[PDB]
Design a protein around this ligand. Sequence first.
Ligand code: X39
Lengths: 317, 10
Amino acid sequence: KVTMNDFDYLKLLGKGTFGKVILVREKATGRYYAMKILRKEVIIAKDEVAHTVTESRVLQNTRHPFLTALKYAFQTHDRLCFVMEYANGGELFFHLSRERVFTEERARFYGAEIVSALEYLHSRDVVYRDIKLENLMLDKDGHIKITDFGLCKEGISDGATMKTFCGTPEYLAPEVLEDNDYGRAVDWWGLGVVMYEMMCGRLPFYNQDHERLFELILMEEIRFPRTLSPEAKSLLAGLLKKDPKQRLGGGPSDAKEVMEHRFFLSINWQDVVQKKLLPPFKPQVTSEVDTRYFDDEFTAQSITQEMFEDFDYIADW
Amino acid sequence: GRPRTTSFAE
Ligand SMILES: NC1(C(=O)NCc2ccc(Cl)cc2)CCN(c2ncnc3[nH]ccc23)CC1
């Protein structure tokens, strides 16, 4: 049994509407984790129960080096807490904003890890649906860790479809902006957007007004920098194909199509998951409490069932 | 250097 009192609460790492993430130390072990704390009252009143139970189930039933693992999930009378592996290197969003653009080789390393994580997810019948720079963290070694599983859909195999209008606006696949249902190829669209941001230094489609933004996504052709390699242009054009049936990854073989693309020719896929590749950037933290890869905006801030049947959990690691 | 984005569901 796990309680709030089993932890020291050190720094705010992130803060959504529906909760906050705090850097915590487990007192008995001296180990550090990221705790997501949600308020039950808010979760219930705002109809976020299904998403929260889904994130719990997904985290309970996945194990992969490029997904953040769940150590403990527990509840109190007014809170739900997820204790997860702490990604010390912060969000890819942090890094890309600092550096403006990544080399193709650096984007390839991250892209390959994301492809492996997506492959694994789809193999567990999970569609992730929210690939974006904020949800892609770096661990202490510089490997990708996908976080935030609340928008996942489970039990999606092969060509099964989904109906919920969800994700993040700037990253929505064109089929999601049409009526009716969509399949798992939405995840390859999201990879293409993040890859495009990594190698081109901006979103492929952007407007502050969601009506204009969604028009661009549906109707505008993407542009490439003249000096992007032909293989990177081809990868991006393939993942950002508007028709999911023509999209790279959109066919029956799903991730395999992406892994086979010439952009990834140099990648040994069997080695990606075994983490034999030296990452192109190791976070230079000087302590487990060093939050230099997280925004001051958050880290400066001080920190003063039936329905939830499938929630609680203790890992076998 | 885009603004931070927000996930949603309807
Ligand atoms: N990208 C993160 C974030 O801020 N997401 C927004 C957010 C905040 C709260 C809630 Cl309830 C939902 C979304 C993901 C969670 N955090 C992490 N930072 C470091 N290591 C981590 N491991 C797992 C999560 C996490 C902090 C960074």
